[PDB]
Amino acid sequence: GLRQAERNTEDGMSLIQTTEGFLQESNDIIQRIRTLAIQSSNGIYTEEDRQMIQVEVSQLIDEVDRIASQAEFNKMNLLQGDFARGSRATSMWFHIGPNMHQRERVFIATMTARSLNLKGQSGELLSLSTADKSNDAIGTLDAALTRISKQRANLGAYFNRLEHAAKGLMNAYENTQASESRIRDADMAEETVAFTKNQILVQSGTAMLAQANVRPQGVLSLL
Amino acid sequence: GLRQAERNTEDGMSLIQTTEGFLQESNDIIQRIRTLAIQSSNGIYTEEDRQMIQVEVSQLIDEVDRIASQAEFNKMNLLQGDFARGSRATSMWFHIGPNMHQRERVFIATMT
Amino acid sequence: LMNAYENTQASESRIRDADMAEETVAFTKNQILVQSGTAMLAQANVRPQGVLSLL
Numbered sequence: 001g002l003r004q005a006e007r008n009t010e011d012g013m014s015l016i017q018t019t020e021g022f023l024q025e026s027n028d029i030i031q032r033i034r035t036l037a038i039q040s041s042n043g044i045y046t047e048e049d050r051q052m053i054q055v056e057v058s059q060l061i062d063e064v065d066r067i068a069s070q071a072e073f074n075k076m077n078l079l080q081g082d083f084a085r086g087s088r089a090t091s092m093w094f095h096i097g098p099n100m101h102q103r104e105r106v107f108i109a110t111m112t113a114r115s116l117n118l119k120g121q122s123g124e125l126l127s128l129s130t131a132d133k134s135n136d137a138i139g140t141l142d143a144a145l146t147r148i149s150k151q152r153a154n155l156g157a158y159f160n161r162l163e164h165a166a167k168g169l170m171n172a173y174e175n176t177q178a179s180e181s182r183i184r185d186a187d188m189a190e191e192t193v194a195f196t197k198n199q200i201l202v203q204s205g206t207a208m209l210a211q212a213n214v215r216p217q218g219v220l221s222l223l
Numbered sequence: 224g225l226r227q228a229e230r231n232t233e234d235g236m237s238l239i240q241t242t243e244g245f246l247q248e249s250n251d252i253i254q255r256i257r258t259l260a261i262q263s264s265n266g267i268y269t270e271e272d273r274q275m276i277q278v279e280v281s282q283l284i285d286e287v288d289r290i291a292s293q294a295e296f297n298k299m300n301l302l303q304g305d306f307a308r309g310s311r312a313t314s315m316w317f318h319i320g321p322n323m324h325q326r327e328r329v330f331i332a333t334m335t
Numbered sequence: 336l337m338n339a340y341e342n343t344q345a346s347e348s349r350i351r352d353a354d355m356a357e358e359t360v361a362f363t364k365n366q367i368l369v370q371s372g373t374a375m376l377a378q379a380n381v382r383p384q385g386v387l388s389l390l
Contacts, residue, residue, distance in 0.1 A: 018343060097293055104289075150278075157281075158282065161286045168245070171244040172294075175244045176241065206385050206389070209389070
């Protein structure tokens with residue numbers, strides 16, 4: 001059980017790292033969006049230039065949604081929110097122990113464009129078409145960065161806890177294996193000594209028996 | 224009696240070794256929270272940063288409690304205080320000897 | 336995609352690739368046990384040889 005639990009913990013660690021992998025790209029894209037919004041707020045650009053910036057924003061919000069709906073693991077989509085706090089669809093657990101309910105729960109919040117305020121509830125994207133609604137567009141991008149960073153911090157906490165659990169599982173496995181060996185495993189030297197003593201005994205006994213069969217022939221001389 | 228007592232000694236020794244191995248990782252974790260606390264005391268961090276490192280703090284405290292409640296031996300928990308000094312639940316005696324009595328108590332403090 | 340590739344390859348190696356250290360340890364233990372077992376079998380083969388001294 002300890003060996004299997006160590007393996008399971010290390011698999012879950014791999015899962016956490018592969019989720020943080022997509023989280024990194026999401027963070028970088030949101031940061032680029034914030035830089036573009038800072039640029040667009042300037043008063044020297046006309047409406048056409050802001051429209052080009054909006055084309056860029058739409059194009060690299062679409063792939064944010066792409067990572068949200070495609071960041072996957074072994075036949076499990078991760079960032080859709082199936083393993084969120086209030087999610088009903090499913091729950092994610094790690095069996096990190098060798099007996100009964102030695103499990104743990106891991107939460108991954110929604111990371112779709114809707115949840116990050118990059119997309120409206122009706123499907124409209126965050127717009128940089130004019131200065132007025134692009135000046136406050138930063139006020140949603142910093143919140144999106146904060147949410148992404150908070151999820152990353154949660155994932156890192158799970159990472160560290162799973163590392164400590166794996167090390168402890170390995171130590172406990174070694175100690176328990178040693179303890180079991182000291183009870184079931186046989187010491188070769190002492191058992192060999194006993195076997196040699198018994199072998200000498202059986203040879204002596206069979207020699208003495210064989211010489212004991214010839215004892216009663218002495219009476220035959222009387223006849 | 225002596226032959227069996229030596230086996231009793233070595234199995235109690237194994238139990239002690241297992242307990243120490245369990246406590247090792249808890250010591251390391253507590254060191255980690257101490258480092259995190261020293262980091263958090265700085266005056267440049269904001270409240271949200273302190274909260275997000277408190278996330279890791281909680282994810283370490285629950286690990287400590289998990290280790291305390293799950294560190295087990297042959298059908299007996301150890302770190303939960305069952306074998307403490309004032310503990311009423313049970314007591315531990317190692318029969319390191321070939322005749323009656325010759326037992327020695329071993330105390331394990333609560334680690335919750 | 337490159338990041339996902341490296342992470343998923345790490346996971347696959349985690350699940351399938353063998354650890355040479357522990358495998359070598361087990362192999363060594365098994366072959367020592369094999370040597371001891373064949374020595375004991377050879378020794379047990381000549382064990383009933385002491386009976387014929389009675390004849």
